[PDB]
């Protein structure tokens, strides 16, 4: 049965027929739904059918479905897998696969942009030093002085014989988190472990709240190497508020570039264990999650006290009021610094447009409602009222085990 998908605000219904193209199981079963879980719990013919399916997707996308080029490409893949157990993508196929992985990413609210992705082929990378150069170019390109551009850099794929290329950091730009044996964390508590790893591999730590981490880059079967990002590469935006002057005094800042660097890109059965990608932020990621999460910088209380709100009682809605102001400060500060950012209303509106384009284009769109609805003001955005079907299509971005 294809799911009927209703928008409860508008009363419109669609049917998702794209989900029939899914070949991998998600975590749910008829007995229990595990849709709110963040992470999953856990042969040549199998590779060949994913390869062929991907090759088919590619030629169908260039309208050449059945051309001489198509049949001879399938024959190449076949021959290469039969001989070697693996195969290699053409650059054009890689580009198409990377865009498709993004298009297919159920957790991404920014998929309206899926077609505009700069793909850097870094599969000719042979050392951690080279990965660093490619990463530097990526940041430079993606950052573009604040006029951010979506980009992905694709490092060599996994091979049966060897260790993976990996970037140990979960993002290219992350702030350190220094633990104190009196429990507390200075900086970003989300990055305590990668901070410790960096120090342990010989990084000299700072002691600030916003110390940019170096990269730990690992070439196959080698100790990772440490590479400090040149300060000039890392665009940061100090946070101010358009009307509250004390807000500046908070000393808050955030980096411009959200660049995920720990996910696996799977295309046609091939796996790219290092393929960092970046777009631009949606303000709530910074304002709400990174700054207000209790296990992140956790600044709600501080902002609320400065706003002189009654903090002694939840029913004064001090948290909500402070959150709004902090999100406002992020938007304003990014706008002032001329750095691309999207607010959650604009982003979700674009996502609804994306759902509509995809319905027409493919008969569905995999979407993870818990991730698409923003972390504040949920029902004030259109996506809250929109039913969504979540499923895994390939090419995909997948989580993978931490390399240590």
Ligand X SMILES: C[C@H](O)[C@H](O)[C@H]1CNc2nc(N)[nH]c(=O)c2N1
Ligand Y SMILES: Cc1cc(N)nc(CCc2cncc([C@@H](CN)Cc3cc(C)cc(N)n3)c2)c1
- Residue 27 sits in the site that holds its own copies (CB under 8 A): yes
Using the structure block, give the residue that is written with the tokens 């989300």.
Answer: 190
Site track 357-396 with ligand HEM (rule: CB under 6 A), x = hit: --------------x-------------------------
| Rounded least distance, CB 164 to ligand HEM, Å | 18
Distance CA 291, CA 315 (A): 22
Contact 378, 370 (CB under 8 A): no
Among positions 10, 20, 28, 380, the unique one binding Zn ion when judged by CB under 5 A:
28
**Which of these, 176, 213, 218, lies nearest to 404 by C-alpha position?**
218
Ligand-binding annotation for 246, yes or no, is: no
Q: Choose between 96 and 397: whose C-beta lies nearer to ligand HEM.
A: 397
Structure tokens belonging to residue 41: 């719990």
Ligand-binding annotation for 155, yes or no, is: no
- Residue 206 sits in the site that holds its own copies (CB under 8 A): no
Distance CA 246, CA 212 (A): 25
Site track 156-175 with ligand Y (rule: CB under 6 A), x = hit: --------------xx----
Q: Choose between 48 and 355: whose C-beta lies nearer to ligand HEM.
A: 355
- Residue 42 sits in the site that holds ligand Y (CB under 6 A): no
Among positions 277, 334, 351, 391, the unique one binding ligand Y when judged by CB under 6 A:
277
Cα–Cα–Cα angle for 211, 330, 167, nearest 5°? Answer: 40
Instruction: List the single partner that 277 binds among ligand Y, Zn ion, ligand X, none, CB under 5 to 8 Å by kind.
Output: ligand Y
Binding residues among 190-249 for ligand HEM as defined by CB under 6 A? none
Burial class, 126, CB count within 10 angstroms (exposed 0-12 / middle 13-18 / buried 19+): exposed
- β-strands 264-267, 151-154: how paired? unpaired
| Rounded least distance, CB 170 to ligand Y, Å | 4
Helices (H), 179-280: 192-200, 246-249
Contact 284, 299 (CB under 8 A): no
Q: 2 vs 14, 20, 21, 141, 382, CA distance in Å?
A: 10, 8, 11, 42, 23
Distance CA 237, CA 294 (A): 22
**Which of these, 171, 208, 218, 217, lies nearest to 191 by C-alpha position?**
171
Instruction: List the single partner that 223 binds among its own copies, Zn ion, ligand HEM, none, CB under 5 to 8 Å by kind.
Output: none
- Residue 282 sits in the site that holds ligand Y (CB under 6 A): yes
Say which of 285, 292, 358, 365 is annotated catalytic.
285
- Residue 143 sits in the site that holds ligand Y (CB under 6 A): no
Verify whether residue 280 is a known catalytic residue.
yes
Verify whether residue 64 is a known catalytic residue.
no
Among positions 54, 168, 255, 277, the unique one binding ligand HEM when judged by CB under 6 A:
277
DSSP string, 39-78: S----HHHHHHHHHHHHHHHHHHTT-TTSHHHHHHHHHHH
Verify whether residue 306 is a known catalytic residue.
no
Binding residues among 353-382 for ligand X as defined by CB under 6 A? 370-371
Ligand-binding annotation for 365, yes or no, is: no
Binding residues: 28, 33, 36, 108, 171, 280-281, 285, 290, 370-371, 384, 399
Question: Where do contacts with ligand HEM occur on this chain (CB under 6 A)?
Answer: 102, 105, 107-110, 113, 117, 150, 152, 260, 263, 277, 279-280, 282, 285, 342, 347, 371, 397
* Catalytic center residues: 108, 111, 280, 285
């Amino acid at each position: 049965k294809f799911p009927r998908v209703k928008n409860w605000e508008l009363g419109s219904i669609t049917y998702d027929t794209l989900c029939a193209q899914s070949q991998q199981d998600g975590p749910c079963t008829p007995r229990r739904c595990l849709g709110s879980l963040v992470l999953p719990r856990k042969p040549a013919e199998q590779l060949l059918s994913q390869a062929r399916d991907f090759i088919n997707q590619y030629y169908s996308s260039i309208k050449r479905s059945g051309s001489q080029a198509h049949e001879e490409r399938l024959q190449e893949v076949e021959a290469e897998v039969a001989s070697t157990g693996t195969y290699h993508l053409r650059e054009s196929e890689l580009v198409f696969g990377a865009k498709q992985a993004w298009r297919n990413a159920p957790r991404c609210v920014g998929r309206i942009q899926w077609g505009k992705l700069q793909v850097f082929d870094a599969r000719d990378c042979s050392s951690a030093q080279e990965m660093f150069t490619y990463i530097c170019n990526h940041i430079k390109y993606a950052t573009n002085r604040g006029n951010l551009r979506s980009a992905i850099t694709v490092f060599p794929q996994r091979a049966p014989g060897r260790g993976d290329f990996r970037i140990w950091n979960s993002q290219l730009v992350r702030y350190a988190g220094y633990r104190q044996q009196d429990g507390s964390v200075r900086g970003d508590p989300a990055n305590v472990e990668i901070t410790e790893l960096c120090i342990q591999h010989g990084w000299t730590p700072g002691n600030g709240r916003f110390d940019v981490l170096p990269l730990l880059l690992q070439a196959p079967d080698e100790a990772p190497e440490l590479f400090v990002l040149p300060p000039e590469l890392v665009l940061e935006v100090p946070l101010e508020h358009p009307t509250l002057e004390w807000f500046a005094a908070l000393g808050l800042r955030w980096y411009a570039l959200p660049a995920v660097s720990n996910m696996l890109l799977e295309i046609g059965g091939l796996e790219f264990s290092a393929a960092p990608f970046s777009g631009w932020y949606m303000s709530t990621e910074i304002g709400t999650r990174n700054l207000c999460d209790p296990h992140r910088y956790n600044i709600l209380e501080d902002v609320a006290v400065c706003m002189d709100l009654d903090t002694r009682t939840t029913s004064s809605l001090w948290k909500d009021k402070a959150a709004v102001e902090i999100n406002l400060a992020v938007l304003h500060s990014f706008q002032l610094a001329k750095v691309t950012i999207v607010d959650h209303h604009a982003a979700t509106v674009s996502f609804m447009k994306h759902l509509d384009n995809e319905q027409k284009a493919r008969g569905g769109c995999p979407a993870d409602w818990a991730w698409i609805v923003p972390p504040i003001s949920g029902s004030l955005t259109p996506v809250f009222h929109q039913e969504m079907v979540n499923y895994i299509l390939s090419p995909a971005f997948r989580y993978q085990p931490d390399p240590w």
